[PDB]
Amino acid sequence: QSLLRIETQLLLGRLLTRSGDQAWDFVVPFALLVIFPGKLQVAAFYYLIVKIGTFLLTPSSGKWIDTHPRIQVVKWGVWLQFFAILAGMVFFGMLDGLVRAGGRESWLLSVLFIALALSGVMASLGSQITDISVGNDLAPSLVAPEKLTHFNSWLRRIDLATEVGAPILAGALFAFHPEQLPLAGLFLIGLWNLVSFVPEYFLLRNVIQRSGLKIKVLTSDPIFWLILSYALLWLSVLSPHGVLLAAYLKDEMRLPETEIGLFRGLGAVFGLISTVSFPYLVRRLGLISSSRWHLGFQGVTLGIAVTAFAMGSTASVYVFLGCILLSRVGLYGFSNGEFELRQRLIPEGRRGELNSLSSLTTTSATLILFSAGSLLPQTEDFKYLVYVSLAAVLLANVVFIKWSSR
Ligand SMILES: [K+]
Ligand SMILES: [Zn+2]
Ligand SMILES: [Zn+2]
Numbered sequence: 001q002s003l004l005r006i007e008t009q010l011l012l013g014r015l016l017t018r019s020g021d022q023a024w025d026f027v028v029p030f031a032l033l034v035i036f037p038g039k040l041q042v043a044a045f046y047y048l049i050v051k052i053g054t055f056l057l058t059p060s061s062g063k064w065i066d067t068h069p070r071i072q073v074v075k076w077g078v079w080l081q082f083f084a085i086l087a088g089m090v091f092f093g094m095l096d097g098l099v100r101a102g103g104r105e106s107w108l109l110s111v112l113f114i115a116l117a118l119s120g121v122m123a124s125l126g127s128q129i130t131d132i133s134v135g136n137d138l139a140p141s142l143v144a145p146e147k148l149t150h151f152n153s154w155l156r157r158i159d160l161a162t163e164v165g166a167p168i169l170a171g172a173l174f175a176f177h178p179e180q181l182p183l184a185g186l187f188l189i190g191l192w193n194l195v196s197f198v199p200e201y202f203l204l205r206n207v208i209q210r211s212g213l214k215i216k217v218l219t220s221d222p223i224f225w226l227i228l229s230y231a232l233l234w235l236s237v238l239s240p241h242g243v244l245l246a247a248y249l250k251d252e253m254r255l256p257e258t259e260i261g262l263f264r265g266l267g268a269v270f271g272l273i274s275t276v277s278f279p280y281l282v283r284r285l286g287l288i289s290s291s292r293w294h295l296g297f298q299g300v301t302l303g304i305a306v307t308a309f310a311m312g313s314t315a316s317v318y319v320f321l322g323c324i325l326l327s328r329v330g331l332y333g334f335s336n337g338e339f340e341l342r343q344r345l346i347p348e349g350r351r352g353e354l355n356s357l358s359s360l361t362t363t364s365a366t367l368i369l370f371s372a373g374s375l376l377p378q379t380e381d382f383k384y385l386v387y388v389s390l391a392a393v394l395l396a397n398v399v400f401i402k403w404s405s406r
Contacts, residue, residue, distance in 0.1 A: 003143075006207070007151055011158055013203040018162040020196035021127075023170035023189050024085065026264065028120075029247040030174055030257060031186045033379075035095045040382055043247050044373025046117050051367060053121035054128075061125060070133045070219055071208045077129030078201040082194060084122035089190040091116035096183050134204060138215045142207070163268040171261025223345065225403040227358050229295075230338045232396035233331065234365035236389035237382070238302055238324050240267025244373055248382045253317065263321055270325045274332035281333075287344070288404055291337030295400055298330030299393045306390050309383070 029043045036042040065073055095112050103109065140148060173192075176185030208215070237244045240263050249255045249263070274294070281290035305323035308316040346354050372385060 003147070006210075007154075010203050010207070011154055013199045014155070015158055015162065016196035017200040018159060019166040019169070020193040022162050022166035023173075024193045025243075026167045026170045026246070026261065027174045027186055027189055027257075029243045030250055031092055031096075031183060033247050033251045034183070035092075035099050037251060038379055040244070040247055040251065040379040041374055041376045042113070044244060044370045044376065046113070046120065047243060048367070048370040048374050049114075049117045050120040050124065051363075051370065053118065054124050055363070057121065057125055058128065061129065065129065065132060065219055067218065069217055070135075070138075070215065071205065073129060073133035073219055074201070074204050074208065077126045077131075077133060078197060078204070080126030080129060081123050082197050084119050084126055085190055085193050085197075087119040088116060088123065089187055091119060092183065092186065092190075093181070096181075130204075132219055135215070135219065141215055142211050160268060160272075164265040167261040167264040168258065169261070171257040171259070175257045220345070222403070222406070223342075223354070224357075225399055226338070226341060227354075227361050229396045229400035229403060230335070231358065231361035231365050232392050232399060233298075233335075234362045235369055235392035236302075237369070237385045238305060238327065238389045238393075239331075240264040240324065240328070244369075244382065244385065248379060249321075251379045252382070255317075263325075266325050267328055270328035271332040273329040274336065277329060278333035278336055287337065287340065291334050291341065292397075292401065292404055294330040294333030294337065295397050296330070298327045298334060299390075299397050301327040301330065302390050302393055306386060309386060 028046075032043045032046060033040070091112050095109065095116065098104070098106075098109055098112065143151065170189055173189050174185040176188070178184055181187070236242075239245065246260055246264065249260050250257060278290055278294060281293055284290075285293065301323045305320050305327070308319035308323065342351075342354055369385075372388070373382075376382060376385075
């Protein structure tokens with residue numbers, strides 16, 4: 001019944017489920033292009049209706065949680081993801097089974113896909129439900145701020161371990177590919193996700209029962225351009241954490257799933273470089289200049305990436321992907337600058353209004369992005385999203401530089 005015991009358990013429990021989510025969410029675009037090879041539109045349209053279906057059901061779900069005990073909301077959300085991942089695997093096995101019949105001409109296939117995406121909605125919806133029940137003020141209201149700052153120091157390390165490790169572990173397991181079934185690797189990662197959910201439910205439920213009353217029983221116009229220049233970066237496809245690029249690298253580039261996993265894992269590593277560079281430039285150039293020098297550094301590294309992207313050789317793909325990793329240092333740096341600049345220009349009172357406006361602009365860019373992806377002719381035409389991405393980054397510089405004159 002020691003605090004350190006409770007801490008280590010929750011950490012290990014999070015280690016499994018965070019790796020489970022990261023692995024599963026990384027192999028989804030892969031499984032969508034073995035059922036629909038050459039057709040990236042499916043992957044984009046899948047994520048498009050998942051994003052829309054989640055947004056339209058977010059305020060609808062809030063009314064059925066606002067007056068319910070946290071110990072039940074956890075019971076719902078966690079197991080809601082469990083049955084949504086399971087339903088995802090079922091629809092996946094059927095879609096591959098129907099195409100291999102086959103089988104794509106029937107309207108039966110379209111039904112399975114809509115159902116599949118609907119399942120993807122429930123998984124993300126159940127994820128939100130679990131997050132709200134666990135809340136934001138529940139962690140500080142449970143532990144002293146001195147023992148929490150030590151605890152939060154471990155979370156960053158563990159979340160880093162999953163963001164770097166799980167995509168590599170996923171790409172290896174997904175690369176199973178036996179004679180039958182060819183999606184056995186996907187099913188294992190899906191099972192990985194399920195097994196990692198049952199300690200999550202218990203560890204999050206036991207912490208509620210342990211602390212009954214400690215937590216709650218129930219559950220500027222010129223500042224717009226600063227938001228915009230950050231929201232324009234949500235229009236880009238050039239990211240190791242991006243799903244569209246991962247599908248293009250697996251279908252057209254025909255790169256091994258494991259190296260694509262490594263490529264994603266190395267993305268979080270360059271993110272750490274920003275945690276040293278961005279603070280350095282702040283004390284040396286200024287907060288505003290550091291943001292510009294990071295956003296500018298992002299736009300100049302992505303410029304090289306597109307240049308190498310036009311060559312199309314075994315060496316050019318190495319430079320292309322490499323510059324994308326190098327661009328992360330600038331992105332993560334500018335993204336931090338985005339947050340702190342708002343923390344210095346907006347009081348703690350009306351900070352809630354700002355965060356919501358950003359959640360409207362950035363999400364719009366997300367919808368716009370996958371909408372463009374849903375209008376693609378083929379995976380080969382994904383290149384047109386690459387040039388748009390760089391333009392979105394270069395213009396994001398223009399918008400920020402214009403705003404920086406203040
Ligand atoms: K999990
Ligand atoms: Zn201490
Ligand atoms: Zn493969």
